[PDB]
Amino acid sequence: TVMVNDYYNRSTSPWNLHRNEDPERYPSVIWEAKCRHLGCINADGNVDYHMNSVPIQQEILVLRREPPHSPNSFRLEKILVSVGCTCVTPIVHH
Amino acid sequence: TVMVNLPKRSSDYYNRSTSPWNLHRNEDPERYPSVIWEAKCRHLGCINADGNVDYHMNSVPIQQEILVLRRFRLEKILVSVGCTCVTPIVHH
Numbered sequence A: 001t002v003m004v005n006d007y008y009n010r011s012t013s014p015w016n017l018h019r020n021e022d023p024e025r026y027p028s029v030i031w032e033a034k035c036r037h038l039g040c041i042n043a044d045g046n047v048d049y050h051m052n053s054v055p056i057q058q059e060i061l062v063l064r065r066e067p068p069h070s071p072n073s074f075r076l077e078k079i080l081v082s083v084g085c086t087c088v089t090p091i092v093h094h
Numbered sequence B: 001t002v003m004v005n006l007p008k009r010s011s012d013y014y015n016r017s018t019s020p021w022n023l024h025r026n027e028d029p030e031r032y033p034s035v036i037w038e039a040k041c042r043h044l045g046c047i048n049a050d051g052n053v054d055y056h057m058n059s060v061p062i063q064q065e066i067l068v069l070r071r072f073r074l075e076k077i078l079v080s081v082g083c084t085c086v087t088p089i090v091h092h
């Protein structure tokens, strides 16, 4: 316990941004990515299913009000967020 | 003033991507967490169907704003989490 005071439009695996809001959380608003397509954009600008768009996830630190509905008392929490998309081969080498 | 009660690589996307990336160690002993693993794109370009680097396309890092604790105050920093492939800006 302590005291405390456009490029994605040009991607071959493009995404949209989605508002993730939670007043019981700091930061209250987190911008999450959702891939537009299951395939990737090929050279003619069409979705190609020989490759797949996949979201990249990241574990983010967050402050959660503890106990519920407290203006100045928080607990440190980790959550998983989608930060963007990449284009991958659908097969795995494992 | 508020009261606060107090790295791995588990996905294979980094290697399966047309914009693959490596991880670099970002360490700060007066910070929580002290170690963060940041992505860096492997190539300037992206991998084509033949397995070769296409220098016309661009590999670019995906950044995310994250919360860290510094010796105790709260700070927001930007971190690279992966890379995507984009078509370049080719007009004014």
Ligand SMILES: Clc1ncc(NCc2ccccc2)cc1-c1cccc2ncccc12
Residues within 6 Å of the ligand: A009, A010, A011, A012, A041, A042, A043, A044, A045, A046, B018, B046, B047, B048, B049, B054, B057, B085, B086, B087
């Ligand atoms: Cl410009 C382009 N070039 C290649 C690809 N995918 C193929 C590829 C990926 C990696 C390495 C080699 C080749 C896609 C696009 C592309 C992206 C976004 C919008 C587009 N709108 C119209 C036309 C193309 C678009």
Ligand SMILES: Clc1ncc(NCc2ccccc2)cc1-c1cccc2ncccc12
Residues within 6 Å of the ligand: A012, A040, A041, A042, A043, A048, A051, A087, A088, A089, B015, B016, B017, B018, B047, B048, B049, B050, B051, B052
């Ligand atoms: Cl399998 C493959 N297929 C297509 C691409 N990029 C072209 C493309 C992108 C988007 C839409 C259409 C076409 C790249 C790869 C590829 C990716 C990763 C490693 C590889 N290692 C060897 C050979 C290919 C590899």
